[PDB]
Design a protein around this ligand. Sequence first.
Ligand SMILES: N=C(N)NCCCC[C@H](N)C(=O)O
Ligand SMILES: [Fe+3]
Lengths: 319, 336
Amino acid sequence: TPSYSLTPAEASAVAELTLELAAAYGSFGDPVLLRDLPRLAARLPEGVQDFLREFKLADRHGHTVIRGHDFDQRRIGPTPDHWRGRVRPGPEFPEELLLMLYSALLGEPFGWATQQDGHLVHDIFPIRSHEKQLLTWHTEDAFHPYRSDYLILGALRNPDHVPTTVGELDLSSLSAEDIDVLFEPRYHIAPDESHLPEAARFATIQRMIDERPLGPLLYGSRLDPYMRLDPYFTSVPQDDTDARRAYDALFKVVDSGMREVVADQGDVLFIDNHRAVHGRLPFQARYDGTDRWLKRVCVTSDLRRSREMRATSATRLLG
Amino acid sequence: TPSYSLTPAEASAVAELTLELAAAYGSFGDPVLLRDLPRLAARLPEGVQDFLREFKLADRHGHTVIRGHDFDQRRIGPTPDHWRGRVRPGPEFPEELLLMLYSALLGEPFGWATQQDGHLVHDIFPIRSHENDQLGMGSKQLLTWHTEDAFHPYRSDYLILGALRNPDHVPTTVGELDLSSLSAEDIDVLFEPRYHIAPDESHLPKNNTIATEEEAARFATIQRMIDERPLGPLLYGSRLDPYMRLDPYFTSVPQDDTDARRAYDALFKVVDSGMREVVADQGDVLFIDNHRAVHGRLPFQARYDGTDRWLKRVCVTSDLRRSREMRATSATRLLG
Ligand SMILES: N=C(N)NCCCC[C@H](N)C(=O)O
Ligand SMILES: [Fe+3]
C-alpha cells in the first residue's frame, strides 16, 4: 500500500496554508470557500497533489495515507463532549479545511443533511450518550446509489493508537462462476435508520423503499471488480442458491483479508469506498478531553448525479 | 447567457502558458501530462478559473463561451486534409493543451476508442471523401441538433469546442429547455420511463469487436440495452429545472402511448424554437452542458484548400470510474 511521508518543510507549508485559509474565510458556510477549494488546493505542496492524483487515477488501491502533518495539539484544544449545539468552526478549523482541500483534489465534498446537523466535516470521537463487541466491517452506505466514492479520515489525535480496519477484494480466491453470479442484480441491501434525532425529494429513495430492487455486489471490471458489501444489511432470496453460495465465498475472502491500519496523530487515511471496506475496533474511552479524535469528509466524484435528492442546485447535502 | 471575454493581457498569458506546456510535455500519450492537468489548469488567469467553476457549480445555463484567445495562425498552419496519417501532436498542440486544461477544470477528459483513433482532442474539419455524410467531418449536410449520445449511460457530461479558425463565421446551433413553455402534465410524462432511445451505430456491440471474454464483457450492458429495449425518461434530475436527453433521430415514442406522443411533440417544439445560433469564431472556446443543451451545426461549402473551418473537440466526464466496465484497463480514458 503506497503512502506519502511529508518532510518537515512540507508539513510546515501545509500547516501555514491551513492557518492562512482559516483566517481569510469565515466557515464552510461561506459559498466562496467552496467555490475556491480546487484552486486553493493547488497551493499545497506539489508532491502532495501529485501523490493524491496518482492514487485517484491508478484506481488500484483501496486505501492510502498521507503521514506526518503538523496538527497543533495546543491550538486544536481538548476533545469535545458532543457535536450537537457546539459552535462551528472550532479552533481545529485549519485541519477541517485541510481535509476539504484534499477532498477537492479527489472530487467534491458532500454530506448527509440529517447526519451531524449536515456538517460537511464529520466528527469522530467517543460519546457517553451514544456509548461484548462485534467486529464489523462495511462499505459506507452500500445500499445507496449516491454513496461516497472516497472517504477521508484525518486523525487529530490517537493517543492509544486504536487502528481502523480496512479490507480489499482478492480475486484469485474466487471462482469465475461465483464472480459472474455476484455481478448480477440478485441481492438486497437494506438502508439505515438515522431518523428523527420535501415530498418530491423524499419520494426518490422510495424506489428502493417500496419496490426494493435487487442490485449487484460486484460491478465495474470483471478482472478487477468494484464492490459494495455491507454483510449486516445484505439479503438474498432463499430460492437463489447460487447467489447465496457466491455471497458466502465473497464474505469469506473479504473477512479473512481485513487489515488493521492505524491513523496516528498527523495521519490522513484515504479510503476508496468502491475498492475497500472499513470498520471500527472497540476501545476504552476516557471522556476527559484527551480521547482519540478523527475528522471525516465524504467525497463524491459526480455531484450532479445526486441532484434529485438535493434541496437546491447549490447544496452539497442530500436528503 | 453568461460569457467571458479575455483582456489582451489574459489572452497573452494563456497563449504563453500553452506554448510553455507544449514544449515541456511530449504528447497526450504522456501519462504525466494527464496526471498534471488540474494543477496546470490552476496556472490559467484566475478570472477564467472562477468563471468556469461558477458555470460548473451553478448548474443552470446550458452553454457558455470564453472569447478572445490568441490562436497564432502562422504557427497553427493549414487545415489538414485528413485526421489520419498526421504527425501527432501537430503544430496546433498548444491549443489542444488549452482545451485539455479547460476539461480538467470541468471534470475529466475521455474519448471513444473507435473515434479518430481514440484521440482525446479530436478534429472537426471538412474531409472531401466525407462530404456526403452527416458528421463533424462533413460540410454540405445539415447536422441536426441533439444531446450527444443520448442513449449512453456514460455519455459526455460536457463538450468543449475550440475554434482554431472559422473564416466564413459558420455558427454552431445550440438549444436549451425553457421549462415554463410546457404543461405540468407533459413534464410528468417526460419524467417517466416511456421512451426508447436507440444507440448510434458506432456503439453497437456487433459493430465493434468483441471476440474473447475480456472484450465481450465490455459491451454487455449495451448488448442488454439492445436486447431488452428498456424505456426511459427524456427529462430527469430536478422537476423544477430538469436535465434532458433529446436526440430526435434516435428516439421512438411507442405508438400506443398517446400521452408520451403528445408530450414529446410538445418538448420537441419548445427546443426546436429555442434554437440559437452561436458563432465560435477564431479564438472562441464553446462549453456545452450535455445535460442541459442540445447542439448541431449548419451546412456549409468547404474549399478543401487548407483554409477551411477547423475546430478541436474534447468530451468531459464528471466521473471516469462510472464507465469502468467499458474501459480496457483502469488507466485508459477510452470507452470501447
Ligand atoms: N514530461 C515531463 N516529465 N514533464 C515534466 C515537466 C513538467 C513541469 C511543469 N510544467 C512545471 O513547470 O512546473
Ligand atoms: Fe463506516
